[PDB]
Amino acid sequence: MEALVYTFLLIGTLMVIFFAVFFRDTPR
Amino acid sequence: VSLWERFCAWITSTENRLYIGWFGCLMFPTLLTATSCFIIAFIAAPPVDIDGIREPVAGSLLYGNNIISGAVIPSSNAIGMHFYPIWEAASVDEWLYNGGPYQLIVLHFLLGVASYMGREWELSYRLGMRPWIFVAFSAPVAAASAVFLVYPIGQGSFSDGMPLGISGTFNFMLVFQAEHNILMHPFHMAGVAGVFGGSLFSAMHGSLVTSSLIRETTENESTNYGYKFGQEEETYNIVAAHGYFGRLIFQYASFNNSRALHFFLALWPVLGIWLTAMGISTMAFNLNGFNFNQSVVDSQGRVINTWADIINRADLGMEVMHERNAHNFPLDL
Amino acid sequence: AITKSELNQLSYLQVKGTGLANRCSEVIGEDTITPKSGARLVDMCIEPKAWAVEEEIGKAGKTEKKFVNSKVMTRQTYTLEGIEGSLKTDGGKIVF
Amino acid sequence: TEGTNEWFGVDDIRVLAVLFIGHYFILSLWLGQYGNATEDDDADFFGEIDYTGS
Amino acid sequence: ILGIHLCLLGLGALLLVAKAMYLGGVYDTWAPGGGDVRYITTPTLNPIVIFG
Amino acid sequence: EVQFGAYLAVLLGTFLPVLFLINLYIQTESRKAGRDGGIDS
Amino acid sequence: MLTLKILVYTTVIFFVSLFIFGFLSSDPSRNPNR
Amino acid sequence: KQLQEIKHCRLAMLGAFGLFFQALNSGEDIVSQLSPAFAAPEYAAKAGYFLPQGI
Amino acid sequence: TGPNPNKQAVELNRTSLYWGLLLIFVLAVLFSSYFFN
Numbered sequence: 128m129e130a131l132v133y134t135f136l137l138i139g140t141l142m143v144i145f146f147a148v149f150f151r152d153t154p155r
Numbered sequence: 156v157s158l159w160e161r162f163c164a165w166i167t168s169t170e171n172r173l174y175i176g177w178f179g180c181l182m183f184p185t186l187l188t189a190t191s192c193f194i195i196a197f198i199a200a201p202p203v204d205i206d207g208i209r210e211p212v213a214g215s216l217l218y219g220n221n222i223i224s225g226a227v228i229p230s231s232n233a234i235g236m237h238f239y240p241i242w243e244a245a246s247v248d249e250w251l252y253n254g255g256p257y258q259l260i261v262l263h264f265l266l267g268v269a270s271y272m273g274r275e276w277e278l279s280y281r282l283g284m285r286p287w288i289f290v291a292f293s294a295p296v297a298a299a300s301a302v303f304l305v306y307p308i309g310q311g312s313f314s315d316g317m318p319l320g321i322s323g324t325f326n327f328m329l330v331f332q333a334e335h336n337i338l339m340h341p342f343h344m345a346g347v348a349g350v351f352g353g354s355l356f357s358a359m360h361g362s363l364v365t366s367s368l369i370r371e372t373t374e375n376e377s378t379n380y381g382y383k384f385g386q387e388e389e390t391y392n393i394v395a396a397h398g399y400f401g402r403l404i405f406q407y408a409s410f411n412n413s414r415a416l417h418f419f420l421a422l423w424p425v426l427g428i429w430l431t432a433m434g435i436s437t438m439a440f441n442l443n444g445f446n447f448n449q450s451v452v453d454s455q456g457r458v459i460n461t462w463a464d465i466i467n468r469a470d471l472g473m474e475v476m477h478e479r480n481a482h483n484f485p486l487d488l
Numbered sequence: 489a490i491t492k493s494e495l496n497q498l499s500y501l502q503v504k505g506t507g508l509a510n511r512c513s514e515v516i517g518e519d520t521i522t523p524k525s526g527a528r529l530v531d532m533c534i535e536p537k538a539w540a541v542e543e544e545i546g547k548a549g550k551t552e553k554k555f556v557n558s559k560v561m562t563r564q565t566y567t568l569e570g571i572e573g574s575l576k577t578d579g580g581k582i583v584f
Numbered sequence: 585t586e587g588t589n590e591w592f593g594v595d596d597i598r599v600l601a602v603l604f605i606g607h608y609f610i611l612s613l614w615l616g617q618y619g620n621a622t623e624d625d626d627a628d629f630f631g632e633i634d635y636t637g638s
Numbered sequence: 639i640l641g642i643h644l645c646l647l648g649l650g651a652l653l654l655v656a657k658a659m660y661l662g663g664v665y666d667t668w669a670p671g672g673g674d675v676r677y678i679t680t681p682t683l684n685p686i687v688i689f690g
Numbered sequence: 691e692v693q694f695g696a697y698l699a700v701l702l703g704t705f706l707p708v709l710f711l712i713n714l715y716i717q718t719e720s721r722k723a724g725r726d727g728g729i730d731s
Numbered sequence: 732m733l734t735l736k737i738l739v740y741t742t743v744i745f746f747v748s749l750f751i752f753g754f755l756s757s758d759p760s761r762n763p764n765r
Numbered sequence: 766k767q768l769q770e771i772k773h774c775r776l777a778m779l780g781a782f783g784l785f786f787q788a789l790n791s792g793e794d795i796v797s798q799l800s801p802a803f804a805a806p807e808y809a810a811k812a813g814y815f816l817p818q819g820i
Numbered sequence: 821t822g823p824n825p826n827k828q829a830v831e832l833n834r835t836s837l838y839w840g841l842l843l844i845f846v847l848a849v850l851f852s853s854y855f856f857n
């Protein structure tokens with residue numbers, strides 16, 4: 128039942144990375 | 156304008172959010188398939204017989220592993236260095252029983268990282284830069300290739316490659332120290348010096364540059380807000396930093412030229428990593444480190460021990476216990 | 489290939505990797521042998537071609553002991569070869 | 585199979601057919617742009633990079 | 639220049655072949671009766687084998 | 691098998707700081723929008 | 732399993748040909764000093 | 766046409782010389798000499814494909 | 821692409837905050853016993 132927790136944490140980290148890359152503050 | 160010309164114009168365009176280029180045509184599909192297979196295998200793969208003795212080992216989360224202990228097991232010892240694609244198996248279940256995904260992941264991944272290096276050079280060329288960043292990136296690529304491909308080639312089996320897990324690397328390192336006596340190879344010493352010196356130089360450079368900031372904010376504003384994108388200010392008010400470094404140590408040792416300083420910064424860790432990767436590649440063919448066991452004797456002829464003998468005892472303890480059921484004969488050739 | 493005489497005409501480099509080494513040979517004819525005394529069966533080969541495991545399955549509102557088919561997880565390493573024995577006759581019957 | 589020594593792993597006609605189809609399709613697309621090149625001695629240049637149009 | 643030095647390389651390869659076939663022979667480790675020096679009298683020329 | 695309190699520890703210690711940081715960012719953006727006169731106050 | 736081999740071969744040759752014929756299309760002239 | 770004729774004449778002189786001497790040396794015609802070197806010798810080609818399907 | 825003229829602001833005064841907090845806490849108090857069973 129902890130496999131759910133592990134999967135949730137990993138997918139959340141990947142979502143954070145996606146949002147950081149594609150929704151980012153403009154450097155200008 | 157032909158269709159091919161328009162396609163070529165789009166591929167090599169600098170207006171895209173992420174550059175594609177022609178090395179991208181190889182980088183993207185391979186990396187994507189490797190990522191998909193790795194995620195699926197790490198989550199839900201069945202146990203794999205790695206030693207060829209019909210003793211499967213579990214490595215997936217669904218089979219009772221946590222993040223630290225989970226891994227993707229290398230292929231079976233019975234396969235050896237033979238190519239094992241999916242279509243060469245009688246069924247997908249047999250492919251998963253013999254550690255099929257490892258070969259797929261490692262091969263598509265190595266192709267991907269080589270294409271990544273090429274793409275770095277290509278964008279540098281298109282932007283009008285100098286073409287030597289990918290030379291710096293070549294060292295981690297060399298190390299990863301060294302382990303994953305070169306060690307199995309020398310030892311004669313894919314089952315000796317580094318597992319794709321956290322504790323798999325620990326197992327790999329312990330067995331490698333037991334069998335090859337690393338930590339006495341000078342190339343490993345070079346690599347350790349490289350990483351330690353890289354960290355030291357990074358900390359020194361950061362401290363020196365940050366200390367020499369000019370006052371433009373006062374108190375209620377983070378000091379990072381004083382810099383503007385496009386501001387012209389050389390990366391160190393000299394008198395301060397130069398005098399500080401000339402007074403801290405022997406004065407004649409002070410880099411007053413930025414080009415030489417940054418060149419040395421680039422040179423040190425890259426050379427260290429190159430040397431350690433070559434050390435691993437050479438030890439893949441059984442050219443081990445220094446051996447000083449029983450080298451000091453008294454007048455009569457009895458043996459006086461040193462620290463190398465204690466290291467040897469630890470190596471013997473590691474050696475007699477690894478792969479317990481796999482050996483049948485006295486020598487581990 | 490199929491008979492021993494054809495198999496002996498190939499070289500080892502010509503058989504490696506094909507999968508012919510795990511096969512069993514074929515015989516052609518319908519005659520009689522009648523073993524003398526001091527005979528020995530030599531070069532016996534046994535090759536399975538189907539596997540099944542006893543279990544309990546449900547057919548229609550009932551459960552029975554039925555043999556279910558299974559897939560070989562290993563590879564072509566399951567053929568027995570080279571078996572030898574000594575033949576004899578007890579009361580007109582052969583014993584291996 | 586696995587350890588046999590076929591050229592490029594080709595063991596069937598379909599594999600050879602698809603390889604030919606791929607190389608030829610991309611080749612025809614490239615030809616649609618570079619199929620009018622001539623070898624006459626005035627399309628050459630004297631330099632390090634061919635800037636002479638097409 | 640490339641063609642000239644390439645022709646030289648080809649001549650060198652043919653010289654090795656001539657040494658193997660006529661000028662004493664080479665050491666063959668698969669010799670019938672123990673490894674020894676012998677003349678290679680019938681080299682294979684079928685292009686399928688070489689290019690395979 | 692595993693300890694039950696780890697569920698509570700992991701989930702709470704992950705969820706609370708995330709919401710704290712999101713609140714910080716959102717209040718900063720709201721103050722910035724308020725300072726510059728516009729349709730959204 | 733043969734159909735999987737056919738599809739994979741098609742994909743690989745497609746991408747490799749894209750690479751090969753892309754680098755032949757007067758690549759050295761695609762620089763900002765044209 | 767005259768240029769083509771003379772070129773083909775010289776080339777055919779060379780070709781006829783080569784064909785005649787190859788036939789004399791090998792004791793065979795050109796077809797039986799080139800045909801074997803197209804697929805494989807028998808002693809080198811693999812036995813075949815014997816892996817059972819469906820297991 | 822451009823500046824959307826349909827964006828607006830969201831407000832919440834202290835009284836509504838107190839009402840929401842009280843509602844959430846009281847609802848949890850009521851349903852906890854049945855959730856635990």
Ligand code: CLA
Nearest residue numbers: 268295296298299327328329331332346347350431432435
């Ligand atoms: C304090 C002690 C100490 C120190 C400092 C080191 C230091 C080192 N050891 Mg070591 N070692 C030690 C003790 C120590 N060792 C002991 C006691 C043992 C015996 C048990 C060993 C046994 C040992 C072995 C067996 C090996 C080392 C290796 C190394 C080197 C690591 C190479 C590396 O990380 O860069 C290399 C960098 C990489 C591999 C990274 C590649 C990155 C790829 C290209 C891209 C990855 C991208 C990623 C997948 C996706 C990113 C995510 C995305 C979202 C951004 C390093 C010099 C290794 C070595 O020499 O390497 C060749 C090695 O094989 N050591």
Ligand code: CLA
Nearest residue numbers: 646647648649650651652653654655657658663664665666
């Ligand atoms: C394709 C070239 C080739 C290859 C594969 C070999 C292979 C061999 N030779 Mg040989 N040889 C060659 C050319 C070649 N030779 C030539 C041209 C000469 C004349 C100088 C000789 C002279 C020679 C002698 C005198 C002897 C050998 C011997 C040997 C054997 C062991 C030596 C060894 O380690 O080989 C190392 C060879 C290589 C690493 C070559 C690999 C080349 C690969 C295929 C790439 C080539 C393509 C290249 C990149 C060009 C690109 C073209 C461009 C359009 C892209 C081995 C079977 C020895 C032996 O066993 O004899 C009994 C021996 O005594 N050779």
Ligand SMILES: CCCCCCCCCCCCCCCC(=O)OC[C@H](CO[C@@H]1O[C@H](CS(=O)(=O)O)[C@@H](O)[C@H](O)[C@H]1O)OC(=O)CCCCCCCCCCCCCCC
Nearest residue numbers: 345410411412413414415416417418419420422423426427
């Ligand atoms: C016994 C032989 C056996 C083999 C030994 C090989 C030794 C090769 C020595 C020459 C190699 C190139 C020297 C540097 C060139 C350059 O990049 O300049 C960059 C500057 C030169 O100084 C800068 O030089 C400038 C002048 S000039 O342009 O370089 O002429 C000057 O303007 C500036 O102020 C100054 O900072 O050098 C550095 O700051 C980088 C430091 C690392 C470079 C190597 C320095 C010497 C190392 C000795 C060998 C160490 C062995 C380590 C073993 C792992």
Ligand SMILES: CCCCCCCCCCCCO[C@H]1O[C@H](CO)[C@@H](O[C@H]2O[C@H](CO)[C@@H](O)[C@H](O)[C@H]2O)[C@H](O)[C@H]1O
Nearest residue numbers: 589590591592593594595596597600686690803804805
């Ligand atoms: C040729 C591929 C079709 C697949 C059928 C069987 C696959 C086994 C061999 C495939 C790969 C081996 O490479 C192959 O090269 C030769 C041609 O280049 C083949 O030879 C083939 O082509 C010759 C030339 O027309 C024909 O006369 C032969 O009948 C044919 O067998 C060999 O059979 C094989 O060695």
Ligand code: OEX
Nearest residue numbers: 310314315330478487488
């Ligand atoms: O797999 Mn990995 O470690 Ca190279 O030695 Mn033998 O094998 Mn196993 O034992 Mn020791």
Ligand SMILES: [Cl-]
Nearest residue numbers: 481482483484
């Ligand atoms: Cl053993």
Ligand SMILES: [Fe+2]
Nearest residue numbers: 364389390391
């Ligand atoms: Fe800077």
